[PDB]
């Protein structure tokens with residue numbers, strides 16, 4: 001699909017840089033016609049068919065197609081798309097409150113419940129995010145009594161219409177499920193593993209699989225080499241550990257689903 005090729009600078013003024021990704025830079029911006037504020041994600045296009053630099057148009061279009069389906073309070077929403085020779089520019093809802101990690105169990109579950117609601121939305125649409133990790137969990141406004149989380153960064157996300165996708169889809173070693181590490185078929189279940197990692201870090205401030213090098217982390221993930229350290233998890237409830245234990249499970253078929261996680265006694269009201 002082709003996107004708007006007028007100069008984005010004719011319709012928007014860009015501000016401070018918000019953040020980055022590989023082959024992407026995110027800048028604050030303001031639409032001239034409404035005065036409304038957005039985040040402009042500039043994604044660098046591949047210059048040739050065989051190039052390693054930049055993002056292939058197939059990958060850019062997938063991210064855009066998924067974003068267009070999404071309207072939920074816990075997920076970032078897409079406003080407009082522009083392009084030129086160098087970049088595709090996604091005009092995205094501005095999420096200004098920072099990364100969530102930037103805790104009591106009540107406070108953790110408060111944010112975790114919103115993450116689960118957002119992932120429940122995506123999985124209901126057969127969308128696997130595949131990139132879930134703390135830096136992709138943002139706060140809309142951190143000055144409100146009840147801060148809203150928004151899931152961001154759909155750059156790895158895929159529709160799973162067959163129940164699994166066989167592709168090389170590989171995120172950050174600390175957060176990827178064993179089936180990603182092992183290059184096996186992937187599905188919504190990989191997101192549920194990442195949720196278990198996030199939950200472990202949310203409660204303890206420690207990363208369950210993190211090794212001294214990337215290969216060590218990957219090896220730890222594939223072997224499910226983690227434990228709840230007493231120093232970190234003393235005074236953490238047994239139900240909280242139960243919730244994590246049922247997510248960090250090598251066999252994707254045995255892992256809790258998003259529906260299971262919402263009915264788990266630690267989460268369920």
Ligand SMILES: O=C1c2ccccc2C(=O)c2c(O)c(O)cc(O)c21
Nearest residue numbers: 018019020021026039095152153154
């Ligand atoms: O880094 C950021 C980022 C940093 C500070 C605020 C918002 C964002 C943000 O919305 C964002 C995306 O939506 C994305 O799709 C990839 C990103 O890297 C970011």
